[PDB]
Design an enzyme around this catalytic site. Structure first.
Site, PDB file in Angstrom:
ATOM      1  N   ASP A 123      71.852  18.940 -66.004  1.00 34.27           N
ATOM      2  CA  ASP A 123      72.744  17.838 -66.467  1.00 34.27           C
ATOM      3  C   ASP A 123      72.379  16.605 -65.583  1.00 34.27           C
ATOM      4  O   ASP A 123      72.957  16.310 -64.628  1.00 34.27           O
ATOM      5  CB  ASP A 123      74.029  18.297 -66.149  1.00 34.27           C
ATOM      6  CG  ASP A 123      75.168  17.117 -66.548  1.00 34.27           C
ATOM      7  OD1 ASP A 123      74.590  15.973 -66.931  1.00 34.27           O
ATOM      8  OD2 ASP A 123      76.369  17.496 -66.300  1.00 34.27           O
ATOM      9  N   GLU A 158      75.325   7.697 -67.211  1.00 29.94           N
ATOM     10  CA  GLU A 158      76.083   8.598 -68.098  1.00 29.94           C
ATOM     11  C   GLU A 158      77.407   9.113 -67.528  1.00 29.94           C
ATOM     12  O   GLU A 158      78.297   9.093 -68.190  1.00 29.94           O
ATOM     13  CB  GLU A 158      75.176   9.540 -68.634  1.00 29.94           C
ATOM     14  CG  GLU A 158      75.884  10.596 -69.436  1.00 29.94           C
ATOM     15  CD  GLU A 158      76.805  11.754 -68.913  1.00 29.94           C
ATOM     16  OE1 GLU A 158      75.929  12.436 -67.844  1.00 29.94           O
ATOM     17  OE2 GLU A 158      77.736  11.872 -69.255  1.00 29.94           O
ATOM     18  N   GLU A 159      77.475   9.466 -66.311  1.00 28.65           N
ATOM     19  CA  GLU A 159      78.607  10.363 -65.785  1.00 28.65           C
ATOM     20  C   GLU A 159      79.627   9.275 -65.462  1.00 28.65           C
ATOM     21  O   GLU A 159      79.159   8.220 -64.786  1.00 28.65           O
ATOM     22  CB  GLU A 159      78.080  11.315 -64.592  1.00 28.65           C
ATOM     23  CG  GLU A 159      76.861  12.264 -64.848  1.00 28.65           C
ATOM     24  CD  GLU A 159      77.477  13.629 -65.469  1.00 28.65           C
ATOM     25  OE1 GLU A 159      78.848  13.550 -66.003  1.00 28.65           O
ATOM     26  OE2 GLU A 159      76.815  14.594 -65.767  1.00 28.65           O
ATOM     27  N   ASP A 205      70.734  16.853 -73.606  1.00 27.87           N
ATOM     28  CA  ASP A 205      71.683  17.078 -72.465  1.00 27.87           C
ATOM     29  C   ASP A 205      72.091  18.339 -72.215  1.00 27.87           C
ATOM     30  O   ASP A 205      72.100  19.209 -73.218  1.00 27.87           O
ATOM     31  CB  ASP A 205      72.632  15.851 -73.205  1.00 27.87           C
ATOM     32  CG  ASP A 205      73.744  15.415 -71.689  1.00 27.87           C
ATOM     33  OD1 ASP A 205      73.354  16.051 -70.838  1.00 27.87           O
ATOM     34  OD2 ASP A 205      74.555  14.885 -72.107  1.00 27.87           O
ATOM     35  N   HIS A 287      79.294  21.240 -64.237  1.00 27.87           N
ATOM     36  CA  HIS A 287      79.923  20.299 -63.328  1.00 27.87           C
ATOM     37  C   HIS A 287      80.407  21.169 -62.205  1.00 27.87           C
ATOM     38  O   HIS A 287      81.497  20.870 -61.844  1.00 27.87           O
ATOM     39  CB  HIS A 287      81.079  19.739 -64.219  1.00 27.87           C
ATOM     40  CG  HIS A 287      80.571  18.405 -64.895  1.00 27.87           C
ATOM     41  ND1 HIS A 287      81.132  17.274 -65.181  1.00 27.87           N
ATOM     42  CD2 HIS A 287      79.279  18.138 -65.338  1.00 27.87           C
ATOM     43  CE1 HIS A 287      80.630  16.435 -65.887  1.00 27.87           C
ATOM     44  NE2 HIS A 287      79.389  17.015 -65.960  1.00 27.87           N
TER      45      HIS A 287
END
Ligand SMILES: COc1ccccc1[C@@H]1C[C@@H]1NC(=O)c1ccc2nc[nH]c2c1
Ligand SMILES: [Zn+2]
Length: 318
Positions: A123, A158-159, A205, A287
């Site tokens: 990620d 992105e995050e 992704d 995550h």
């Protein structure tokens, strides 16, 4: 008229001998050491690793023989943490070609509190490495492109910084899609944007976990999803995949029915066809601090590299 060409574009199918040559020509170990490992660092926007990841991606592309043209799309935006700088990386072959197949991932990592640091192995360090390894493995073929070429996009930001929300997410992709939508393409044209030039956005992704399942998200790329299915089937049949079962296919033909927010949303909502190569479910380590190198599945990434490279060559008639 030319923006409609993507709707009728056919792949050029490669024969068994070509497929073996492609599977032979990619090296998972080379990618691991030279593209993936330098990216396994904290790289949230503006961090030292953000600059270092950016510099590593640009240097790996610049050393190739293909005539890649690098552009940095840098901008400021407010965030929950205050104003931040973001830099998308765009690497384009044949910039003035009307059409481009676009491969893309995000190269930032999610910011987590400070023994363990989040390096976002799946990620999306692995997607970044897969794109660089594709550029390397296909360099000689791509060299022969010196109205369709190839473009790579490495999104920044992105995050979410704080809480996943429309305003705290997809900083780079939302900026770049707006920019491309406003930019004439070809230069001097009336009506058509750089987004009309995007034949297909293939967004990688959360790749790297064992046993991924990619569903068929979008009807207007479903025929390209079926090519990925068929490439996977043929490489398996030819014995060119490692630790791979037909009963454990990566690409299954059913959909998700929901909405998986990701860097493709700003492009999708403006009409760009999207092949969203994100697994559902997400990797189990998603995550968490366990989204690290040790929990990656090398053979699965190797298999996907082979599938993606065949797909891109067939798309480009190379
Ligand atoms: C720790 O996770 C969280 C806890 C509280 C608030 C927000 C989050 C995080 C934002 C993530 N949500 C996502 O949907 C998401 C979607 C697409 C992604 N492509 C790479 N990474 C992604 C994450
Ligand atoms: Zn994430």
């Amino acid at each position: 008229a030319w923006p409609e060409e993507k709707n009728y574009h056919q792949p050029a199918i490669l024969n068994s001998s070509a497929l073996r040559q492609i599977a032979e020509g990619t090296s998972i170990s080379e990618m691991w050491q030279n593209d993936l490992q330098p990216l396994l660092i904290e790289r949230y926007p503006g961090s030292p690793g953000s600059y270092a990841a950016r510099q590593h991606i640009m240097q790996r592309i610049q050393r190739l023989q293909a005539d890649w043209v690098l552009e940095i799309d840098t901008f400021l935006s407010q965030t929950p943490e205050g104003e931040r700088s973001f830099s998308n990386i765009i690497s384009t072959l044949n910039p003035t070609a009307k059409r481009h197949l676009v491969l893309a991932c995000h190269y930032d990592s999610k910011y987590f509190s400070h023994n363990r640091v989040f390096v976002g192995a799946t990620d999306s360090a692995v997607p970044c490495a897969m794109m660089l390894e594709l550029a390397r493995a296909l360099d000689k073929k791509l060299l022969s492109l010196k109205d369709l070429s190839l473009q790579l996009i490495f999104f920044d930001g992105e995050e979410a910084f704080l809480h996943w929300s429309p305003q705290d997410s997809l900083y780079g992709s939302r900026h770049l899609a707006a920019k491309m939508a406003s930019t004439p393409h070809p230069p001097g044209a009336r009506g058509t944007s750089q987004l009309h030039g995007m034949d297909l956005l293939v967004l990688l992704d959360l790749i790297g976990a064992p046993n991924p399942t990619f569903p068929n998200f979008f009807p207007n790329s479903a025929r390209w999803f079926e090519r990925l299915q068929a490439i996977e089937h043929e490489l398996h049949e030819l014995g060119l995949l490692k630790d791979h079962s037909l009963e454990g296919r990566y690409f299954q033909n059913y959909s998700y029915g929901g909405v998986i927010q990701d860097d493709h949303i700003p492009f999708l909502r403006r009409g760009v066809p999207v092949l969203h190569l994100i697994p559902s479910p997400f990797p189990e380590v998603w995550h968490t601090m366990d989204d690290n190198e040790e929990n990656l599945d090398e053979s699965t990434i190797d298999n996907l590299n082979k599938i993606l490279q065949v797909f891109v060559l067939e798309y480009l008639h190379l």
